[PDB]
């Protein structure tokens, strides 16, 4: 619970209503002074204002999941026994489908345009995907590990075995626990775009 050096240690206060917020010494691993958790609430109540661009832009698929929840319709609760099939199905509805090694390479090309490498054929077909999100990431300074983690979350598939019955589409695979357990099923229809 250390802090970045400089004016960063001056936008929080030192002591607020008796409570401590920070220290005054120096550490030995990253060579800084510690903080409180009252600091992490003080910034939420009384800090400087940020901006709100990019934070909407880089997370969209879970907003799609949100509106898929909020546009869904339910049906009848059922009873009685069920029969299941232990099947490896895609868990979440992926955005686009691509191999992960070349996917990591092309998002590394997005990260480093001058250190991208050679224009390959996968880079040539994905260059419009490169540019149409390189225009999206302009208005922020979100850290590249956050960008790369959201990109590898939004682009790589997810296959595991599980018992399942009724439907097979990955929206239903995401909502199977609200569908059915072991003595009951629920008629459910997801909503919006899939």
């Amino acid at each position: 619970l250390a802090l970045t050096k400089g004016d960063m240690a001056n936008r929080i206060p030192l002591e607020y209503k008796g409570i401590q917020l920070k220290t005054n010494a120096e550490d030995i691993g990253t060579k800084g002074q510690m903080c409180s958790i009252a600091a992490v609430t003080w910034w939420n109540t009384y800090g400087p204002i940020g901006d709100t661009e990019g934070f909407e832009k880089v997370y969209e698929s879970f907003f799609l999941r949100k509106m898929r929840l909020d546009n869904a319709t339910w049906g009848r609760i059922t009873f009685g026994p069920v029969e299941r099939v232990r099947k490896r199905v895609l868990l979440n509805p992926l955005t686009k489908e691509m191999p992960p090694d070349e996917a990591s390479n092309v998002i590394m090309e997005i990260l480093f345009p001058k250190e991208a490498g050679i224009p390959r054929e996968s880079t040539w077909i994905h260059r419009e995907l490169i540019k149409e999100k390189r225009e999206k990431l302009k208005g922020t300074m979100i850290t590249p590990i956050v960008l790369a983690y959201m990109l590898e979350r939004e682009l790589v598939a997810r296959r595991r075995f599980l018992p399942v019955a009724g439907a097979t589409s990955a929206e239903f695979i995401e909502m199977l626990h609200c569908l059915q357990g072991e003595n009951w099923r629920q008629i459910y229809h997801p909503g919006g775009n899939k």
């Binding site: 609760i77 609200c178 003595n183 009951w184 629920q186």
Partner: protein, 511 residues
């Protein structure tokens, strides 16, 4: 090339060279190998199963009925049927427990300085003149604002919580000539009789009091029908246990273990004092700050996971120590006072136990609200069996009665050898306090008995459904059961309840 030598060294019995083993291993005949060994095998190496009958289901462990065995004690960590703390009133502001103690005892200052002790049931090693001075200096360090929980350096806790009672480790080459250096023996479990009072504690931690000390944080709203029926069953259950007494027991234990571990971390050598607290609301909404107890913790440098610290647990009591004297052989009983609480007499005896815990028991005690889940899913399996009989949501057939299924009477107790039928809420209280008392005095022998008796329960189930199982070793199963029924008071009384249940299935299974 030494690997080739060892590859020849792992020749089996019969061949010489690994090359000879290989030329053997690809150029030998398939047939004429196994049936000649079948003709060669002994006529005794067999299994020879055996059909299961009622008449071999003997009483499990009839050595409990012999009357020349000592009584089953109560050797748990706190007090369950005989709880008594003082009657308080505050607003609802969750204060510090120092102030809760400094409030509730200062309210009842009849017991402020009752410095006239009367020793009652002093045991074989507990001594009067360290406990009394210890307890009086302790409560003279609750009613002052010098600081929060601590003690002072005195000999009294240095006896009753035990400084210096470990050995000195010394290098082993001088541990050779001294002939006293001998290995220990295992702890000999003294066999013990049947229980005649734990039946009353299953009669008493299942009664509707006028108290409730359970909070659960809220969840979001719902629109789904599965969420409707889920919260429906949840609210019916939490309505039907909230006035049990074991809820008060549970929250005493959880707050106790939480405070215990948290102050053992936060204080390693300063001997703390923890108020045993459980706030309980009344029916109308008025709070009660019920203080019943004070603890004492010794020096607590805990390296691994079976370090232990001496937890002396004082606790004010109501019922006299003079009915079942064998139940309390580790119970020093001072006498301090008496209180006409509402009507007639109830006395003040504080029961200065000595005790100890290790960190697995503390961390496993902080988890002890989990038993709600096990009772809940047990109830869930019960009602899914019931709705498998009918066809739809049928807990509405349980609390009020639906179109086909009446609220069915559940057999719970038996009077003069004739069964009684408690209500559904009675049986759910029972299942809850069973999974609690499985925790309260639970050590490895209970897991052993349960994990071995599960097969016999499956067997008697299949016997009830006329399947007629076949068992290779009845004596193996019974030896596995009664190897460990020795000295934990839930285990033995579970075996007695088993023997009576088996007698009932025997007399009712005539058709």
């Amino acid at each position: 090339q030494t690997i080739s030598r060892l590859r020849d060294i792992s020749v089996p019995a019969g061949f010489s060279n690994f090359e000879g083993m290989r030329s053997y291993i690809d150029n030998i005949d398939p047939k004429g190998a196994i049936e000649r060994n079948l003709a060669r095998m002994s006529p005794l190496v067999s299994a020879t199963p055996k059909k299961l009958k009622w008449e071999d289901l003997r009483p499990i462990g009839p050595h409990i009925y012999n009357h020349e065995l000592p009584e089953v004690p109560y050797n748990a960590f706190l007090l369950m049927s005989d709880e008594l703390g003082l009657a308080n009133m505050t607003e609802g502001k969750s204060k510090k427990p120092k102030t809760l103690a400094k409030e509730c005892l200062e309210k009842y200052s009849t017991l402020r300085d009752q410095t006239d002790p009367i020793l009652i049931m002093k045991s074989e090693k507990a001594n009067e003149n360290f406990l009394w001075k210890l307890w009086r200096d302790c409560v003279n360090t609750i009613s002052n604002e010098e600081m929060s929980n601590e003690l002072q350096k005195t000999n009294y806790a240095k006896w009753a919580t035990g400084d210096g009672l470990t050995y000195q480790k010394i290098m082993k080459e001088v541990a050779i000539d001294d002939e006293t250096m001998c290995q220990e023996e295992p702890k000999i479990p003294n066999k013990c009789r049947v229980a005649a009072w734990v039946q009353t504690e299953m009669n008493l931690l299942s009664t509707l009091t006028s108290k409730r000390a359970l909070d659960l944080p809220e969840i979001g709203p719902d629109v789904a029908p599965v969420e409707h029926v889920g919260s429906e069953r949840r609210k019916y259950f939490v309505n039907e246990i909230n006035y049990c007494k074991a809820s008060t027991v549970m929250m005493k234990y959880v707050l106790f273990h939480t405070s215990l571990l948290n102050e053992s971390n936060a204080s390693m050598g300063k001997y703390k004092v923890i108020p045993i607290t459980n706030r309980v609301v009344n029916e109308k909404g008025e709070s009660f700050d019920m203080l019943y107890g004070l603890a004492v913790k010794g020096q607590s440098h805990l390296r691994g996971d079976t370090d232990v610290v001496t937890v002396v647990t004082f606790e004010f009591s109501s019922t006299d120590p003079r009915v079942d004297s064998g139940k309390w052989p580790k119970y020093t009983v001072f006498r301090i006072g008496s209180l006409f609480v509402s009507g007639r007499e109830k006395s003040v005896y504080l029961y200065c136990r000595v005790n100890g815990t290790n960190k697995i028991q503390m961390k496993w005690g902080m988890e002890a609200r989990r038993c709600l889940l096990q009772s809940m899913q047990q109830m869930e399996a019960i009602v899914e069996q019931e709705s498998s009989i009918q066809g739809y949501d049928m807990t509405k057939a349980c609390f009020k009665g639906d179109r086909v299924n009446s609220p069915k009477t559940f057999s719970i107790g038996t009077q003069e050898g004739k069964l009684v039928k408690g209500s559904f809420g009675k049986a759910l209280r029972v299942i809850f306090t069973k999974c609690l008392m499985h925790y309260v005095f639970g050590n490895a022998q209970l897991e052993g008995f349960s994990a071995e008796s599960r097969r016999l329960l499956l067997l008697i189930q299949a016997l009830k459904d006329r399947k007629g199982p076949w068992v290779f070793d009845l004596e193996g199963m019974y030896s596995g059961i009664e190897e460990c029924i020795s000295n934990n008071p839930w285990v033995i009384q579970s075996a007695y309840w088993f023997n009576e249940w088996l007698g009932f299935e025997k007399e009712g299974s005539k058709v």
